[PDB]
Amino acid sequence: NQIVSGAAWTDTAGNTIQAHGAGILQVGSTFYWFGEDKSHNSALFKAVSCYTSSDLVNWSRQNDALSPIAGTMISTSNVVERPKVIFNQKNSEYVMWFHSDSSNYGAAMVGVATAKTPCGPYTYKGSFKPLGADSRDESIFQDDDSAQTAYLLYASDNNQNFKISRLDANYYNVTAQVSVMNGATLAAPGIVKHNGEYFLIASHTSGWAPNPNKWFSASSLAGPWSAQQDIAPSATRTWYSQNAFDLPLGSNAIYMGDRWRPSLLGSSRYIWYPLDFSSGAPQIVHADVWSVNVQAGTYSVASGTSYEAENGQRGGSSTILSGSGFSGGKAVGYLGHGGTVTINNVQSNGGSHWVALYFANGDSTYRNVTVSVNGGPSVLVDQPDSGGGNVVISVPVKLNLNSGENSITFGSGQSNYAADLDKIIVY
Ligand SMILES: *[C@@H]1O[C@H](CO)[C@@H](O[C@@H]2O[C@H](CO)[C@@H](O[C@H]3O[C@H](CO)[C@@H](O)[C@H](O)[C@@H]3O)[C@H](O)[C@H]2NC(C)=O)[C@H](O)[C@H]1NC(C)=O
Ligand SMILES: *[C@@H]1O[C@H](CO)[C@@H](O[C@@H]2O[C@H](CO)[C@@H](O[C@H]3O[C@H](CO)[C@@H](O)[C@H](O)[C@@H]3O)[C@H](O)[C@H]2NC(C)=O)[C@H](O)[C@H]1NC(C)=O
Ligand SMILES: *[C@@H]1O[C@H](CO)[C@@H](O[C@@H]2O[C@H](CO)[C@@H](O[C@H]3O[C@H](CO)[C@@H](O)[C@H](O)[C@@H]3O)[C@H](O)[C@H]2NC(C)=O)[C@H](O)[C@H]1NC(C)=O
Ligand SMILES: OC[C@H]1O[C@@H](O[C@H]2[C@@H](O)[C@@H](CO)O[C@@H](O[C@@H]3[C@@H](O)[C@H](O)O[C@H](CO)[C@@H]3O)[C@@H]2O)[C@H](O)[C@@H](O)[C@H]1O
Ligand SMILES: [Ca+2]
């Protein structure tokens, strides 16, 4: 099946996937996805989880890869973020690295843990400051030279300076700084190698708030690194996400991001998009609905039918808005609080259909919108802050439609203002 960014994702038992700050690993034909368990809606350490799949889309939850230990730096009072796991051929060993911290991010350490099987459970080997310097946001890159040299990529010196450092032959420690970008203020790194060249994907530092994520290239990890460029339209702030893991997919990649929900962390969503490298400059393919053939290293973007909101039938006091950020140059504003718009003649073969809602929300806070099909009972769809009144992003909703024509009404029966609705795409 299909990869629908922003949706609620469940494992094969029907439970919400809890694997934020993703790290991916493949053994044989099996994919492993490690992440932070945030089901307690806290930034503090509950577990590093472990999900497996054969196809990157249908995940079964295994045993937790890492659990708290009272009286250590991986207690429930500490922070464990962004786990990454690589396989060490020499020792036939799985080495996990993670950002290890205290609750106020004052410790700035890395943590290491090992296992003999992919899901572990792993054995914590302790935390430390690499080469004596800060480490907060980090990742691990394992090169394809014959020594399979591995590297730590990490925000250091109070997040100001971004560093790349070689690990020793066991992957247990950092031996030597290889590259630094002073004052880059980079976070959430990942590296993909493409045609012998290295591509670093990273965010800047802005707290929980998303920002435009960048790519940099170099022909060696020592640098020099090219000047930053956007992987997505700058104003969308990486389509409201933050980089987590960049997984190679044929001659391209999959961008794996988080949409952090700081007021409800366990409902932070997963934003996965194809990251296309053919132009030589990585670009997010903004696909509301796509599928992947991970063995062939190919992706496929679902085609949908677009319906502009401004062509629907308004009701109440909803009015047209204009903006260069809008499809057709127009959107329906003053929705909710009396204002509605109904999209008529939505065609369908029947059954369940993903629908992407394209909207602008210039508030610093979320909005939401009611969505009723054919007069039926409404569901309430969350509408994150989009980055401005002229900035459109999309969130998905799954609607049951009848064979033939359908109507979809937006904004009825809510006392708050919904976001400005640009268009919808029925997939
Ligand atoms: C995602 O992974 C799921 C687990 O591997 C997988 O579930 C399995 O799905 C098949 C088909 O629904 C079931 O197979 C059969 O179920 C009973 C046996 O209990 C048979 O009598 C049936 O005739 C049928 O052959 C499995 O039971 C089911 N396993 C579990 C643990 O649920 C899903 O199919 C996968 N989903 C997708 C979209 O690929
Ligand atoms: C990787 O190399 C690290 C040295 O760079 C090494 O870590 C350091 O580890 C020791 C203990 O293992 C720490 O010492 C202890 O002392 C502090 C007070 O300073 C107390 O919190 C504790 O008593 C603690 O036991 C060092 O301070 C620490 N150095 C840094 C810069 O953080 C790691 O153990 C090595 N890890 C592996 C897998 O090799
Ligand atoms: C649907 O979107 C609504 C916004 O369009 C949202 O309403 C808002 O909810 C927040 C949090 O509940 C309120 O928050 C805070 O501010 C008030 C003072 O204004 C304080 O009393 C609180 O302590 C808190 O700090 C917002 O005031 C409120 N904003 C508006 C315009 O109504 C709904 O929460 C959303 N509904 C769902 C189910 O998510
Ligand atoms: O009050 C209900 C009404 O809200 C409108 O939303 C506006 C607010 O979100 C406002 C919050 O600051 O921002 C407006 O958008 C502007 C933008 O158009 C203008 O260029 O200045 C700044 C950019 O910095 C801001 O982003 C936004 O329009 C709805 O548009 C409207 O339908 C109605 O719901
Ligand atoms: Ca429009």
Author numbering: 22 to 448
Paper excerpt:
The exo-β-1,3-galactanase is a glycoside hydrolase from the basidiomycete Phanerochaete chrysosporium (Pc1,3Gal43A), which specifically cleaves AGPs. In this context, exo-β-1,3-galactanase (EC 3.2.1.145) specifically cleaves the nonreducing end β-1,3–linked galactosyl linkage of β-1,3-galactans to release d-galactose (Gal). In this study, we solved the apo and liganded structures of Pc1,3Gal43A, which reveal a glycoside hydrolase family 43 subfamily 24 (GH43_sub24) catalytic domain together with a carbohydrate-binding module family 35 (CBM35) binding domain. The N-terminal catalytic domain consists of a five-bladed β-propeller (Gln21–Gly325), as in other GH clan-F enzymes, and the C-terminal domain (PcCBM35) takes a β-jellyroll fold (Thr326–Tyr448) structure, as in previously reported CBM35s.
The crystal structure of the SeMet derivative of Pc1,3Gal43A was first determined by means of the multiwavelength anomalous dispersion method, and this was followed by structure determination of the ligand-free WT, the WT bound with Gal (WT_Gal), the E208Q mutant co-crystallized with β-1,3-galactotriose (Gal3; E208Q_Gal3), and the E208A mutant co-crystallized with Gal3 (E208A_Gal3). No Gal3 molecule was observed at the catalytic domain in the structure of the Gal3 co-crystallized E208A mutant. In E208A_Gal3, electron density of Gal3 was observed in the ligand-binding site of PcCBM35. 2Fo − Fc omit maps showed that the binding mode of PcCBM35 with ligands is “exo-type,” corresponding to type-C CBM. The asymmetric unit of E208A_Gal3 contained four Pc1,3Gal43A molecules, and each molecule binds to the nonreducing end of Gal3 (called Gal_site 1), as in other CBM35 modules. However, the middle Gal (Gal_site 2) and the reducing end Gal (Gal_site 3) are found in two main locations, although residues involved in the interactions with the ligand in each molecule were mostly shared. The Gal_site 1 forms hydrogen bonds with Tyr355 and Arg388 and interacts hydrophobically with Leu342, Gly354, Tyr438, and Asp441. The Gal_site 2 interacts hydrophobically with Gly383 and Asp384. However, ensemble refinement revealed that Gal_site 1 and Gal_site 2 do not show huge fluctuations, whereas Gal_site 3 has many conformations. At the catalytic site, Gal−1 is anchored in the appropriate position, and Gal+2 appears to fluctuate in a planar fashion as it interacts with the surrounding residues. In the CBM, it was inferred that Gal_site 1 is fixed and Gal_site 3 is adsorbed at the appropriate location at the binding site while fluctuating in three dimensions.
